Write a protein that binds this ligand. Structure first.
Ligand code: FAD
Ligand code: NAP
Ligand code: FMN
Ligand code: CA
Length: 604
């Protein structure tokens, strides 16, 4: 299957590939594909992995061929896994792509080292190869508002396509269902999905290998509150992976498929007067597509809203639009409709009423009571429930049959006056010591190859997680008689008497000599604030010495402000004691990252 041939046979001329890991690039690519119709074109969205991009040179065979790439960037400016083959292709190929027309929208996050590196590389590479850019590279920023970055970009993409191929707005704009409903009245239980992903019964009859499509149901053997206060809830979990064949190393991530709050799901059924226990199936009206269902079908609505659908984040604009038609009351519909406009008051109303106020789907149906959409249409609009990532807090050398998690429970109050709860954390929190569907995702965050190499670990708050495993492995290495270099932890929290994670464990590790140094910064213990970077600055002399000697630096935690301040402080350090300019120090540090001596495991 050549993607070009498939376009020819299904009559399409616009193909939008998506580089996606948590499914955002997918919806974006899907939304572009459906837009084609308004401009007299026929487009399709596709997963690059399922094809050979070297076929891009056969695109001229289709009249008015146009390829659009929605690419997301991951770990150290790399391609999502489904686009690794494509990336590999782009670097070794020197094929001539004259005649190919393209546009690229990258999904990125300014708070990461290589911002939108994938999108930038694809766009730059296609031009070098000869293709013709039909519109400027799009730079979505998940730190600002990705959605807005998208609709803004889209609004200027279509017109630009219209002007190049000589087409126009068919005017037409009638919401088209992508799936068709079918109720299953006479259905056996052995044929109904109860929340497993991929293969039916995969949860009950567990067989390896276990990965994202076949999660291992680990038993929760330990779940204890790590902090003293009751204002927040930091917890430590231990997951049994015995009999799973799963392997991991300190630094890797453990992902889990949670379930929504059962009461919130019930509230939804009640505000839609829908019997959630009705088994059903949603079939793709495009018989030639691979996505026969938006999620494992057949399955009840309850199972769908609890295990396969994201009903907690703020809905994207295109979702608020389709739902407007179910708003009888004049003023409520008004509200919803505009919320999709590019800019104007509509952008502002969306950011304020939906995003800032953090209104989820229920919250909306509650603040627009006239709005009574059918449960099956909603089930098609909403995004999939994603796996959630946590930095493994254990060393496989010490706990080969157990994966540890250190996490803070997300719970806060919204402007709208509701109590918002985090899906995975509240779900994990209610797990009594009983199963969690998980899988390990390999990372590049790793202890030095040589045990004698020093390590500087900077992890405030839950950022301390991967380091708990690092410390265990380093203590275990001293025990096996190996010589180990210095091991310093720069931890931080608010008050030694409230959120000091693993206080006794770390204190004990230090007493034993495993932890060479334990430096904690309490940000709210005195007048002003003490952060990890301040302690890092004070130790400039020693850190420089270790750094000049070949030490490995690790930073884990808040990506927004922490990661950048800690890095700014390491800049100053190298600049002050390295006898060089700031800009040379920035170079210095950035070189360490490429040598693998300054590793980052940051999130937000
Ligand atoms: C590679 C990686 C590693 C990670 N490692 C860890 C780890 O070791 N430990 C850990 O605890 N977490 C970690 N995280 C964060 C973790 O994956 C989840 O995002 C977190 O546990 C929250 O999930 P949730 O499902 O409970 O929240 P969700 O339901 O997904 O909700 C989260 C969203 O709620 C919003 N939010 C949170 N607090 C507020 C507030 N006061 N006001 C307004 N909005 C708010 C934010 O917009 C946030 O994006 C990691 C993330 C990545 C990508
Ligand atoms: O895990 P978690 O999210 O639950 O962590 P967290 O408790 O929110 O925070 C961990 C620590 O990071 C500190 N911190 C906040 N902004 C920082 C910055 N820009 N640079 C360095 N340290 C910072 C916090 O101090 P404050 O919360 O007092 O700002 C706190 O002591
Ligand atoms: C582990 C991880 C690593 C990331 N690395 C980068 C990065 O290097 N550069 C960047 O611009 N954005 C980075 N991001 C942000 C994503 O690119 C952004 O959230 C995007 O919307 C994800 O798209 P997806 O849902 O389609 O996979 C990262 C996100 C995660 C969870
Ligand atoms: Ca010290």
């Amino acid at each position: 299957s050549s993607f070009v041939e498939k376009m020819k046979k299904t009559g399409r001329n616009i193909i939008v590939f998506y580089g996606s890991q948590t499914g955002t690039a997918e919806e974006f690519a899907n939304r572009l594909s459906k837009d084609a119709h308004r401009y007299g074109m026929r487009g399709m969205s596709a997963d690059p992995e399922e094809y050979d991009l070297a076929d891009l040179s056969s695109l001229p065979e289709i009249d008015n061929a146009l390829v659009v790439f929605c690419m997301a960037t991951y770990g150290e400016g790399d391609p999502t896994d489904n686009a690794q083959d494509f990336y590999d292709w782009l670097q070794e190929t020197d094929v001539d792509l004259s005649g190919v027309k393209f546009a690229v929208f990258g999904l990125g996050n300014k708070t990461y080292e290589h911002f939108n590196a994938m999108g930038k590389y694809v766009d730059k590479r296609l031009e070098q190869l000869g293709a013709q850019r039909i519109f400027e590279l799009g730079l979505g920023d998940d730190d600002g508002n990705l959605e807005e970055d998208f609709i803004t970009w889209r609004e200027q993409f279509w017109p630009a396509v219209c002007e190049h191929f000589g087409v126009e707005a068919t005017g037409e704009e009638s919401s088209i269902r992508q799936y068709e409903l079918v109720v299953h009245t006479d259905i056996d239980a052995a044929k109904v999905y109860m929340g497993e992903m991929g293969r039916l019964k995969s949860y009950e009859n567990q067989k390896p290998p276990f990965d994202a499509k076949n999660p291992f149901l680990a038993a929760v053997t330990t779940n204890r509150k790590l902090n003293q206060g009751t204002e927040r809830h930091l917890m430590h979990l231990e997951l049994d992976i015995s009999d799973s064949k799963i392997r991991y190393e300190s630094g890797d991530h453990v992902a889990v498929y949670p379930a929504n709050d059962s009461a919130l799901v019930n509230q939804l059924g009640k505000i839609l007067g829908a019997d959630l226990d009705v088994v059903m199936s949603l079939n793709n009206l495009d018989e030639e597509s691979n996505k026969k269902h938006p999620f494992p079908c057949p399955t009840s609505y309850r199972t769908a809203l609890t295990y396969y659908l994201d009903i907690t984040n703020p809905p994207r604009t295109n979702v608020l639009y389709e739902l407007a038609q179910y708003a009888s009351e004049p003023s409520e519909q008004e509200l919803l409709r505009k919320m999709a406009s590019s800019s104007g008051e509509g952008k502002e109303l969306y950011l304020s009423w939906v995003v800032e106020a953090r209104r989820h789907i229920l919250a909306i149906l509650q603040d627009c009571p006239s709005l009574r959409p059918p449960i099956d249409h909603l089930c098609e609009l909403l995004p999939r429930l994603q796996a959630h990532y946590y930095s493994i807090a254990s060393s496989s050398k010490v706990h080969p049959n157990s994966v540890h998690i250190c996490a803070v429970v997300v719970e806060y109050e919204t402007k709208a006056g509701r109590i918002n709860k985090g899906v995975a954390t509240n779900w994990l929190r209610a797990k009594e010591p009983a199963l969690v569907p998980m899988f390990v995702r390999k990372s590049q965050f790793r202890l030095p190859f040589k045990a004698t190499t020093p390590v500087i670990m900077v992890g405030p708050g839950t950022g301390v997680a991967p380091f708990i495993g690092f410390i265990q492995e380093r203590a275990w290495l001293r025990q096996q008689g190996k010589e180990v270099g210095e091991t310093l932890l720069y931890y931080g929290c608010r008050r030694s008497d409230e959120d000091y994670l693993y206080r006794e464990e770390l204190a004990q590790f230090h007493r034993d000599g495993a932890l060479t140094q334990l430096n904690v910064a309490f940000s709210r213990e005195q007048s002003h604030k003490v952060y990890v970077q301040h302690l890092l600055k004070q130790d400039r002399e020693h850190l420089w010495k270790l750094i000049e000697g070949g030490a490995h630096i690790y930073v884990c935690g808040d990506a927004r402000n922490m990661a950048r301040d800690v890095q700014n402080t390491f800049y100053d350090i190298v600049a002050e004691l390295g006898a060089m300019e700031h800009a040379q120090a920035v170079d210095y540090i950035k070189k360490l990252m490429t040598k693998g001596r300054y590793s980052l495991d940051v999130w937000s």
